[PDB]
Amino acid sequence: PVFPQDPKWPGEGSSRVPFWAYTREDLYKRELERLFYANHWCYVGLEAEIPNPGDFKRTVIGERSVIMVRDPDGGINVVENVCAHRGMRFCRERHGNAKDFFCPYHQWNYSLKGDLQGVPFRRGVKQDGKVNGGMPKDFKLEEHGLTKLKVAARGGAVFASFDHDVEPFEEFLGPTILHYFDRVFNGRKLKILGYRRQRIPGNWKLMQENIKDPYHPGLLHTWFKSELKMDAKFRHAAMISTVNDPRLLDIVPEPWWGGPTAVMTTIFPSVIIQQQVNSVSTRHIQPNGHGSFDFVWTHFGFEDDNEEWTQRRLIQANLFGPAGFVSADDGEVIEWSQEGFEQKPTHRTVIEMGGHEIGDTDHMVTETLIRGMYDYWRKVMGE
Amino acid sequence: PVFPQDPKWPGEGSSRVPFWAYTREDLYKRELERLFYANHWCYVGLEAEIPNPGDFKRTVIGERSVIMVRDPDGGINVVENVCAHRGMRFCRERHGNAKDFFCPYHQWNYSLKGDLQGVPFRRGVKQDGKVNGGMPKDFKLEEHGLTKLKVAARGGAVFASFDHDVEPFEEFLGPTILHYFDRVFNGRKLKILGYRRQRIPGNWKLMQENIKDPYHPGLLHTWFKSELKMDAKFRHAAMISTVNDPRLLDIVPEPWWGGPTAVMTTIFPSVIIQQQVNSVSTRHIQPNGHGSFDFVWTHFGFEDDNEEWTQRRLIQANLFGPAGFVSADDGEVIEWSQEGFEQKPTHRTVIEMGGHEIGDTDHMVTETLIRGMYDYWRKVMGE
Amino acid sequence: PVFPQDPKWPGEGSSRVPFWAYTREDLYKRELERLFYANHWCYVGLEAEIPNPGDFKRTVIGERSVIMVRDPDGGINVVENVCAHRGMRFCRERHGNAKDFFCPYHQWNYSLKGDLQGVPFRRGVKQDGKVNGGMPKDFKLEEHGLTKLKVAARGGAVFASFDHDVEPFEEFLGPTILHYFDRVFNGRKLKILGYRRQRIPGNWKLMQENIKDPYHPGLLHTWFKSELKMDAKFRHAAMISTVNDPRLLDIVPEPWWGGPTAVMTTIFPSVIIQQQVNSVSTRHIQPNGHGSFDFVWTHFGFEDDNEEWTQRRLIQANLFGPAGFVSADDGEVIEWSQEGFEQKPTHRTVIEMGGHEIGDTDHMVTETLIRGMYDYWRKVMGE
Amino acid sequence: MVDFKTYFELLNLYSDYAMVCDSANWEKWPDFFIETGTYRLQPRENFEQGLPLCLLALESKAMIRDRVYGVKETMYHDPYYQRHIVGTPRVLSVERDADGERITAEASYAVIRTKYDGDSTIFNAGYYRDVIVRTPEGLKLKSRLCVYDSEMIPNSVIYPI
Amino acid sequence: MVDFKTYFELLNLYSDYAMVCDSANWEKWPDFFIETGTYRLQPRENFEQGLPLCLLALESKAMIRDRVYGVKETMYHDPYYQRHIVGTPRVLSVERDADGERITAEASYAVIRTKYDGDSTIFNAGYYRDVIVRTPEGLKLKSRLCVYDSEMIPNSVIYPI
Amino acid sequence: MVDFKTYFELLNLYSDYAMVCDSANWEKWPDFFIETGTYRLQPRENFEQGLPLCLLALESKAMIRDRVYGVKETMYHDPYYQRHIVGTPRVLSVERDADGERITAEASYAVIRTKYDGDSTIFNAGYYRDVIVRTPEGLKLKSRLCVYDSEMIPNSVIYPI
Ligand code: FES
Ligand code: FES
Ligand code: FES
Ligand SMILES: [Fe+3]
Ligand SMILES: [Fe+3]
Ligand SMILES: [Fe+3]
């Protein structure tokens, strides 16, 4: 029986993940409902991407286009890129500077906070000698602005959420994972070094798994003191660890680290924060169906970086991204795993390294972060 | 709750269209069943496209390939492009001239009316000295012809319908829509100027809306006394209204207008008749799933046109079509609306301009034609 | 009613195949479960493709990637190309030479028979000075090897099956069809001439039909004493029958035929064995959804062939393959038939040539092989 | 038929046109034409059947400037990158009148479109049929005809082909 | 290695072949070969592994004529446009016998197919490996080998590659 | 600006680079560069905005050799065919110092990927921006910049573009 019928998870615990957890579109739509559109903070960008008032950057949450714009007061608004009249996705550029949002189908104008400021022909058109058209006078702009999202900005990073009753960002991450978040985003002003983008034909969860997988780097990436910590709900995680042209390494330790040499922090479900040697990046997951996701790397540095340090970060970025000596393996194996899952969706994986227990460890020889991820997955999705 | 579960239309009336009306494929299949394959005349072409006997043009109705051929007697037959033996779509050319239709898989020959005239080895094969094979003596040619369609030709335009108990074309359009139809197709013989084709990734209804939208042109198309009329069931509609190289306008009024300056006539669900300034065209909707449709512009002139008038039409076609100064906006906004709809299919549009009434108006400041369209939609599909 | 709703087969017998037999994806997945993954031997290749130990060829059964490798002992193993840890499809090359299979995500090592030989850190890693991680000690390698398939090799051809309780290959083919199988694969060692590949966008069954269609070749391929036999269950079949550059024919009879000049043998559901004049090939069906299939021609000769006979086979191959004078028509009509079926999936084909009888005939003028195919189809699929 | 200097300038003309209309300086498109030059972009079905309708017919350098202005300031469109891959050009003829010489040349082209975060697709493919003349500013187009195979347009053609 | 006139004629040969086999005059395809010329269209997997089988092997101008006739009158096929985009050719060698000079050259190609109302797709991509000789009618192909990357053929190859 | 011999060698350089990086001999990729040559592969969005990040920045022939070794021996990747279609190159400038002459040239490119049994797709499209110098071994790249439109990478870029 290769294709499932009324599937049920193989028992309790999470030491065996069924293949259909990656191949079912109904499960994926429920994932969009419960992990991206409710009860979660999802990454929308960096403050440096929108330094001045009016600066906006288009991005995504789950599969919903949103706009992150800097308000004239200095705050950050996040609105849904869908108009109130007839649902047109009106914002087409990736970035720019606008005093207001506007949809040109019928030229509805909204403030930078999403408030409907103008509707052409709202009170009608008097011609000779009649007033024609107009909106029904019960309709007022207060109720037909852009869907607004709540915003959490911290350390230079910007998250947002459709759910307005979501726990505060700090309580969302928990103390231990928030320590490493702040460890990279330590209050300095960041400078954007650039973007890389890749479309990976696998289930989005496989990327979280890949950055919740601590012992694959020593076995997969042939271009090569650890501890793994989690938040209360096992959703977020932190992995802590201590050639012809010498410039291709030229690794110089940095004081702000300040003792772990590498930390890979997965903030569920939307983002990875990478600190590897001297390269520092965010990795944004943007799902597209159950079997594909886009992956956007924002590589950045700090303002106190001189030009030598900028060159250091840039050259070491050659190890990561869609072409890196290390990172291409990840997309490749994620695609191949998805092919395997689709091949026999009734089967199951075995994530049993380090036992079946879920908890923070002081070694890297365990799949406990994935076991915790799928404990949380079963709880949130009722599977 | 972003994705619908057994959704119901937001109340009665038709002033708010739910997003899932554009995003549901089961709804689209029902649309094909009840609006394209039943109870409707659908556009299949122009008589000038098949002037001589044997001249055929392949086209589509909904998603069903058909062939429109001029009969040796002078009439017009329309048959389904599916063979009776094993259903092969045998006609591959767009146009040509055939003495008869034939499928080459087993060389079944059909008259130009669709009647099965030949089946190789139908009566068997005499060999030595026994007859071998042949069709069962229950098999009769009369029962395995091409699916024949009802054909309606008027003013030079040709519609067809799979439903043979469909109301006559004149009663199908009603007096007013038939009046504007005849205003464009006034009995003169037409000259094909050419074809333009564009694939628009949006729901097909969005095109009808776009030409049942009277006040979007004055707000969307940045390249610049009206009335809107409808048929009995609110399905068809008529919108009536009164640079470096000067040739790009040179607009000259024509007597056949003769009072109105522009009329855009939507014949539901398949065609638009465009009379704009000096450009005259048909715009054929050919759907492909709920989220895409092909759009074929047949630009034509009249036989009495000299070469001055032929250029008037040719140069003014620079304003329309997939690259026109005016028409590209339409496909763009339709695609963007579809993206918005797919983003949050539980939401709803607000088509309240001009109030909530459905009826013929004497101004352009209302969305009443869309309200009538979706009144008819809810009636035909029971939602 | 153009689209089916709770469809039921049109009556009894199998002289009318409904269009939805080719357009339904649930039916296609059931076809994969019951015709490709159970109770059937499916073609995986030729022994000559893997002469030496370690030589492997990657191929497919239904939609499941498998690997056919020659064992160090001289036998042939066939294993599923899916890893046991997290289901990664690990074999990426089409062919090559391997000491063992291995997945590089976490470097699991398997024998060429599929047995899990190595798991890094299975037993843990003692660092300083605690042993950390490892697999639970109830975990046994014996239970997490590659899914092994049963293998049947004969005459140089190699079939495989996931079902290990499958009837023997000889009883699978039956005496009559095994006679022609052995007639082509008569024990001589084969030399591979090469591969041709084509993606045909039609339902895979249409290919079987096409080589169970005896009277189309004289009517479709205009580049032109018979008998056709079937096995007990009507699934397999054998069709037997007796220019500027002259080299494009140069047909020379060869003694091993001997007496039939052409034999087309369909082994359900996966392969065709073609003997046409002096060209001999296998044609492998590799389905991909209900509406497409890949088609791989392996053209081969025999070891005793000189340099004259090799070039003869090569030059005569210009009639077959995706560009052949004869074979391109087949893919074309299969695609067009699929289009027709999708156009009106409630309709039905008429395969009534030669009556309603299912049985071996002494002429080509019958559709009895297709009627038997669909008798078997209805029985296995419960329709 | 042409000397090396003219051949060099001709290949450079084809390449310049392609790469300039892919860049942020695409508004300099009209400069590849003489003042009376024409630009027609026509489907293969219209061209082969003798139907005179084009997708776009700019019958003077002035009308080409009009088109540039319309695209730049009066048309709402999805932004996208486009990339002309122009095949090896071929020279068909050189003729002579009192203005000077005319060169007739052809080249197949493939315009590859990339919307902002999308796959690169064959947007529009066809061939150029050009009459090329020499002006004090170099080789320029007297007439450019773009017969395109990609009749089913991916929704809209905005930037120069 | 070659003088300017020969280089001009060479690029014209590549471009002429491409554009003629995309046009309504594709039947003139055999005219690019000498009477003993060969045309082989072979998958990359067969070529790199030393497997002699081609997708199509026409071992003389006569067999090419055979293919042209078969395609035009004996093969039921979906009509389609095809568009050759031939990359910049490269000249590898010039050799000499009493027969004359032979020029060896290569060029990558991408053939784009457009079915009647469909998207433009990469039908067949690979490269040419040619031996070119000079005849009184100009440069002609003595042998043309098309090693194609697009092994999974989109259903059928009808018109010349 | 350039004489015929140099133009011939330049078109040959573009074609050689393209076809060698499509062949089994792609490891000879560093041989197109001088010892101090650079290779940058950069998204259009970073380039146009002055953002210094590339997809790949090899700042010496030695780093290019590093990349070749890493690709050939240390990276697990899906094997694939790739086919460079390089449009007609354009020569922009020739400049002179005490080292000698530098030629600046550009060419649009389309890289077509074919996974083993898959369709041929537009993997990566953009343009080359080159500074070319003459060495005793022929024309070589001093710097090559590939500004690519195909920002949404189809999962991974392994072989040279
Ligand atoms: S749809 Fe946004 S303004 Fe009409
Ligand atoms: S299917 Fe039309 S002839 Fe057999
Ligand atoms: S999947 Fe093969 S080792 Fe982890
Ligand atoms: Fe990794
Ligand atoms: Fe409009
Ligand atoms: Fe056949």
Side-chain angles (χ1 to χ4, degrees), chain B residues 46-82:
Chain B
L46 301 184
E47 292 212 38
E49 313 198 66
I50 45 156
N52 306 329
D55 286 350
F56 73 90
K57 169 205 160 166
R58 171 166 60 83
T59 176
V60 79
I61 291 176
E63 292 189 10
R64 288 171 78 183
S65 189
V66 292
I67 316 158
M68 162 182 78
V69 63
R70 163 137 302 132
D71 196 271
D73 63 40
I76 294 176
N77 321 326
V78 167
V79 298
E80 182 161 21
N81 188 9
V82 178

Side-chain angles (χ1 to χ4, degrees), chain C residues 210-211 216-217 220-221 326 330:
Chain C
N210 190 82
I211 316 297
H216 94 261
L220 171 81
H221 310 317
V326 161
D330 294 315

Side-chain angles (χ1 to χ4, degrees), chain A residues 168-224 226-317:
Chain A
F169 188 74
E170 298 73 15
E171 270 159 28
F172 179 72
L173 284 181
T176 309
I177 308 303
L178 178 74
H179 167 74
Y180 294 99
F181 178 96
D182 299 341
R183 170 200 177 257
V184 161
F185 302 107
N186 63 16
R188 287 180 291 171
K189 272 286 223 319
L190 323 173
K191 48 182 283 192
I192 305 297
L193 292 172
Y195 304 100
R196 297 153 167 192
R197 311 176 116 97
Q198 60 186 137
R199 174 158 300 155
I200 301 182
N203 190 272
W204 66 271
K205 295 191 289 285
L206 285 176
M207 184 44 84
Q208 288 287 346
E209 292 187 23
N210 184 242
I211 317 295
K212 296 171 178 306
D213 189 338
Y215 75 119
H216 95 259
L219 296 163
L220 166 62
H221 310 317
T222 320
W223 216 93
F224 273 158
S226 287
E227 48 173 13
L228 325 164
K229 297 167 172 304
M230 277 178 285
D231 85 313
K233 274 281 96 195
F234 311 148
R235 49 189 182 182
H236 317 322
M239 305 184 143
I240 297 98
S241 195
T242 292
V243 155
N244 271 278
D245 209 350
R247 285 176 297 177
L248 202 71
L249 292 125
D250 187 59
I251 303 143
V252 173
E254 324 188 40
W256 60 271
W257 273 355
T261 54
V263 174
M264 295 300 296
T265 294
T266 45
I267 296 181
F268 210 78
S270 89
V271 83
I272 288 97
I273 288 86
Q274 154 211 307
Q275 182 274 313
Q276 277 270 288
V277 332
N278 292 132
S279 191
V280 175
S281 76
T282 66
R283 311 177 189 189
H284 190 186
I285 295 173
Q286 319 179 341
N288 273 99
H290 82 261
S292 169
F293 67 91
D294 290 351
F295 207 45
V296 184
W297 311 59
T298 312
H299 284 254
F300 58 96
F302 313 97
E303 269 306 321
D304 52 44
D305 290 317
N306 56 17
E307 279 174 337
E308 196 193 65
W309 275 95
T310 295
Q311 301 290 111
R312 179 136 37 233
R313 313 206 186 273
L314 292 178
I315 293 196
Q316 288 173 287

Side-chain angles (χ1 to χ4, degrees), chain B residues 18-127:
Chain B
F19 281 13
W20 43 264
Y22 311 95
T23 68
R24 297 181 40 195
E25 187 80 3
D26 64 315
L27 282 191
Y28 170 77
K29 273 193 280 159
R30 196 188 305 159
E31 286 181 311
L32 283 179
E33 303 271 34
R34 301 186 182 180
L35 291 155
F36 285 86
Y37 301 159
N39 298 304
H40 297 88
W41 286 101
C42 294
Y43 175 93
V44 296
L46 301 184
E47 292 212 38
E49 313 198 66
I50 45 156
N52 306 329
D55 286 350
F56 73 90
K57 169 205 160 166
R58 171 166 60 83
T59 176
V60 79
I61 291 176
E63 292 189 10
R64 288 171 78 183
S65 189
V66 292
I67 316 158
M68 162 182 78
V69 63
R70 163 137 302 132
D71 196 271
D73 63 40
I76 294 176
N77 321 326
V78 167
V79 298
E80 182 161 21
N81 188 9
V82 178
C83 194
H85 186 5
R86 286 187 230 153
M88 168 159 131
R89 193 192 276 197
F90 57 94
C91 175
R92 297 274 112 196
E93 304 277 351
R94 282 167 152 155
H95 74 275
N97 181 277
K99 299 310 108 188
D100 50 43
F101 297 133
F102 86 103
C103 177
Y105 200 176
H106 302 76
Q107 301 286 348
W108 278 27
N109 188 348
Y110 305 77
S111 75
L112 293 172
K113 303 190 171 282
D115 293 315
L116 180 51
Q117 285 170 330
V119 169
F121 321 127
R122 188 263 189 248
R123 281 258 139 76
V125 186
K126 181 202 124 292
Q127 194 89 28

